[PDB]
Design a protein around this ligand. Sequence first.
Ligand SMILES: Nc1nc2c(ncn2[C@@H]2O[C@H](COP(=O)(O)OP(=O)(O)OP(=O)(O)O)[C@@H](O)[C@H]2O)c(=O)[nH]1
Ligand SMILES: [Zn+2]
Ligand SMILES: [Zn+2]
Length: 612
Amino acid sequence: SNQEKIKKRIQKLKEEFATTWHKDPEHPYRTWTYHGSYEVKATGLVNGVVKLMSKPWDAIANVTTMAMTDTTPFGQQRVFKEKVDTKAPEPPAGVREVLNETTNWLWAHLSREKRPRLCTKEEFIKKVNSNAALGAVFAEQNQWSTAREAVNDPRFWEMVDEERENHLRGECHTCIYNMMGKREKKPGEFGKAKGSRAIWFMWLGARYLEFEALGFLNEDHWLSRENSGGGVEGSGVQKLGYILRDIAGKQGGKMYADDTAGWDTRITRTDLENEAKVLELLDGEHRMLARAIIELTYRHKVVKVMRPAAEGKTVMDVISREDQRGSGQVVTYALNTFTNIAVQLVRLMEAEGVIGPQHLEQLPRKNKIAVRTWLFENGEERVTRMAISGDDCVVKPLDDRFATALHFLNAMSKVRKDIQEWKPSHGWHDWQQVPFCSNHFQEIVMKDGRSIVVPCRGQDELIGRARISPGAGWNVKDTACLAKAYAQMWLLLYFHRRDLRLMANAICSAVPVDWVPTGRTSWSIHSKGEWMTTEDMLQVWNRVWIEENEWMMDKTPIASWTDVPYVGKREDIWCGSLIGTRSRATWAENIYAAINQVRAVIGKENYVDYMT
Ligand SMILES: Nc1nc2c(ncn2[C@@H]2O[C@H](COP(=O)(O)OP(=O)(O)OP(=O)(O)O)[C@@H](O)[C@H]2O)c(=O)[nH]1
Ligand SMILES: [Zn+2]
Ligand SMILES: [Zn+2]
């Protein structure tokens, strides 16, 4: 019967590629049913402006060696084997009973005020025509070039409608996963560095349907701090410091921020079941559509991934399994956030003595009671002791027993990264040490007495990323506008870093004052892009850090950059600054040559001297 639910998708595939379809180089797959293969053409970039404005960093390996993705069949195969051909064991009965109660409570709290609703075509279109259906990677719309043209084409919507009737009928024909490649390991301190991950694509239509049925969780902000207490969905990275500093303001133990080692490979069928409880919030047609997404696309999956063969030849494998995620779903972040809140609530209950190692296998009735009673009595408060964004977590428990509350965690397969399995976690007394969404956060004193909580992250990573140009069809102009997007990002979020302040200015001096930044500087749901503008960045800085800063009680505007603070030198150096260095001194002193060489490549335009 699993065979039954993937039939139509396999069949559509054997048909379309009946030509080259064969069954089996001796395939690698261990935990995925293998159906067959066919021949395909395989699949498989420096920002001159940024490069030119950052000569010292030519000498830094973290920067020069940086690559984002590996789209080759080789990389597809490696990431699949290391992160997808894997199976997390299901938690024991006692643990299942605890997650059951815990997720019942969380669903009821998240739906206390908000009502589910279908998302719409015109809504999807609105989303597509802008700054993307980000992360939920689109790119299969190949009867059209782009998503913009596809959603404008009446025939596209007929495709959607047709599959929509199949779902309303209980079948999926087109909703198929394609593993495009691997996002490379990202940098970070032991226990926070992100491992490699899979990049999933689906037909644009399968994304619409998913978005129609379940997108409400994102569009109506179910995981906003206001709705969920623990979540931070909707906030920009510039808000997260402040939220952490508020959590730190509460009475309790040290602050914890344990990562799970490969969170997406560690979601269980139990977790999916508890997530699938959304269905019970929906009615009529809405629930029918959602039930199909959950059952036919989330649960009975079909996957295409490339593999190297024979004579510099590559095949596409077709495989299936009843599974869960890795992302590639419209609601991956929202459901990761949900499950992670649940996970942390269970950890807190162990830390607080409500449940023990004795309860893993079987949950005594008395304990079932104490669980429901604790959630009811405490859930609303404990949730505010958390900052949860996807698999990222920060939690401040009542006391440091939390450090040893590990039995339920490990039994849930939510094994922590880079620490021995039963070694107590490390917590920090100082909230400014705590890592969260690739940053930490520092409180700094501005010249005028007032203070701000700003985000800091390894500077090499930032320069490295700005140096990368995604283009092939990125212009001189597009290249300069991308460089400008990065520079202005740094001015809004990392102005407190000397080298970046200096490098943002020089980039901005070097690109026409009237060119609008384009492209994207971050994939993070927390990267809001107030820097995608031609508005003077001081004004934008004032708006973010003073005017709209709800932790800023005095609204007195900052008047010049010379009044906008830097971290202390010690910090700047800790996070990768090159100040106090011969090459960076030389660089600061010759900058103008680089700025001029850029103005002279781009040519005669309106420029502005921001180095004053
Ligand atoms: N578990 C999981 N997390 C993801 C996935 N995609 C993005 N993220 C999260 O998004 C956060 C931001 O980093 P990425 O999305 O990897 O890349 P990025 O955000 O463009 O890089 P930054 O500008 O440093 O934030 C990461 O810390 C991830 O935890 C995913 O598919 N699965
Ligand atoms: Zn389908
Ligand atoms: Zn720092």
